Amino acid sequence: IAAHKGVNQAPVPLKMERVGPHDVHIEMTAQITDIEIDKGKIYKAWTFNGQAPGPLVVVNEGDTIHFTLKNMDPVVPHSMDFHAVHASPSKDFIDVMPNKSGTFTYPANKPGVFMYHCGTKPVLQHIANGMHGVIIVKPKNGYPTDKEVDREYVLIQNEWYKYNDMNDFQNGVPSYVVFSSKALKPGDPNTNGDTFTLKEKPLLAKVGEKIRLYINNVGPNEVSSFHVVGTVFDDVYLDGNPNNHLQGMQTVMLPASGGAVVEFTVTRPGTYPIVTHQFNHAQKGAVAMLKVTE
Task: Give the C-alpha distances (Å, rounded to integers) separating 233 from 90, 172, 247, 261.
Answer: 40, 33, 7, 10
Residues 106-125 that bind its own copies (CB under 8 A): 109-112, 114-115, 119, 122-124
Task: Give me the residues paired with residue 107 across strands.
Answer: 64
Q: Is residue 15 at the binding interface for Cu ion, with CB under 5 A as the rule?
A: no
Map the footprint of Cu ion across residues 155-214, applying CB under 5 A: 210
Distances (CA, A) of 143 to 69, 119, 138, 149, 244: 32, 31, 9, 10, 11
Would you say 8 or 280 has its CB closer to its own copies? 280
Count of C-beta atoms within a 10 Å radius of residue 136: 23
Note whether 150 binds Cu ion by CB under 5 A. yes
**Single-letter residue type at 5:** K
- 27 scored as a contact of Na ion (CB under 5 A): no
Task: Give the H or E element holding residue 123.
Answer: helix 123-128
Pick from 30, 79, 171, 285 the residue near its own copies by CB under 8 A: 171
User: Which of Cu ion, its own copies, Na ion, none lies near 63, with the C-beta cut-off 5 to 8 A by kind?
Assistant: none
Question: How many residues at the interface with its own copies, by CB under 8 A?
Answer: 77
Tell me which residues in 76-95 interact with its own copies (CB under 8 A). Answer: 81, 83-93
**Cβ nearer to Na ion, comparing 119 with 130:** 119
| DSSP conformation class of 44 | E
Q: Which listed range, 56-64, 117-125, 134-142, 231-239, lies at the site for Na ion (CB under 5 A)? A: 117-125
Q: Which CB, 81 or 159, lies closer to Na ion?
A: 81
Whole-number minimum distance, CB 166 to its own copies, in Å?
Answer: 8
Strands 245-249 and 252-254: unpaired
Helix (H) or strand (E) holding 198: helix 197-200
